[PDB]
Design a binder for this molecule. Structure first.
Ligand code: SAH
Length: 226
């Protein structure tokens, strides 16, 4: 149709199943609008937690003539999900891993119909993989990509009738991304190493035993996997 998405969200859109998209913390509803204009989905829910983004989403849905196709809802995380909703995809993008984790954990009662989850994490994706484990979700695909110099991970997960246990390396680096180790995987984790060694330039070893132990273990893990 008419909206242009960035590569990050375009990449998320390629994982959408037909039917309904619920986009939590929606980008002025541009992902739901894009999905309906490109016939990826036929119905949308756009969840917003504050009034500014809420009103911007309402205006954007009206401007694209999709008032009867996209429901814009105010509420925190999955609280926007209503018991009558039939949802094929939940998308949670442009957030840190720990916040996506919290939204899924705190809203876990909302996942009873076992939608596909497409999560796009800006940092600390480990926490989201740990939560997906706890909710009987299984990672079926992962992408790591770069846009304007920032490295982003997309995690695609579906329900499993048995809990899938991931190793400490699989939770930290991704069970699919480990199989690749593309230029963006290397760049992300070289940059994390640089940042961890830089923190060591600022912490006296006499005074920060606890944090340095954690930092040194993380460096050792990354140096083994690269
Ligand atoms: N607890 C929460 N529940 C729902 N939305 C939340 C939230 N905390 C933050 N948000 C919203 O999530 C958005 C994060 S910015 C990213 C926007 C879009 N998903 C994208 O990927 O480009 C903002 O709209 C912010 O208000």
């Amino acid at each position: 149709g008419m909206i242009s998405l960035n590569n990050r969200l375009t990449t998320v859109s390629r994982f959408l199943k037909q039917g309904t998209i619920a986009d939590i913390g929606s980008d002025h509803a541009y992902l739901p609008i894009y999905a309906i204009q490109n016939h990826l989905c036929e119905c949308g829910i756009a969840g917003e937690v504050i009034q500014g983004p809420f009103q911007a989403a309402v205006k954007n849905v009206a401007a694209n003539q999709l008032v009867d196709r996209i429901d814009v809802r105010l509420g925190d995380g999955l609280s926007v999900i209503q018991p009558e909703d039939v949802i094929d995809n939940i998308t949670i993008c442009g957030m840190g891993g720990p916040l996506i984790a919290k939204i899924l954990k705190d809203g876990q009662d909302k996942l009873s119909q076992h939608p596909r989850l497409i999560l796009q994490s800006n940092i600390q994706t480990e926490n989201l993989r740990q939560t997906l484990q706890q909710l009987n979700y299984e990672i079926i695909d992962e992408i790591i990509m770069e846009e304007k110099g920032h490295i982003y991970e997309i995690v695609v997960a579906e329900y499993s009738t048995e809990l899938i246990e991931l190793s400490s390396d699989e939770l930290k680096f991704g069970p699919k991304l480990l199989n690749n180790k593309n230029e963006y995987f290397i760049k992300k984790w070289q940059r994390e190493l640089e940042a961890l060694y830089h923190i060591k330039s600022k912490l006296n070893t006499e005074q920060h035993h606890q944090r340095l132990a954690q930092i040194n273990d993380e460096i050792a893990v990354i140096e083994r996997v690269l």
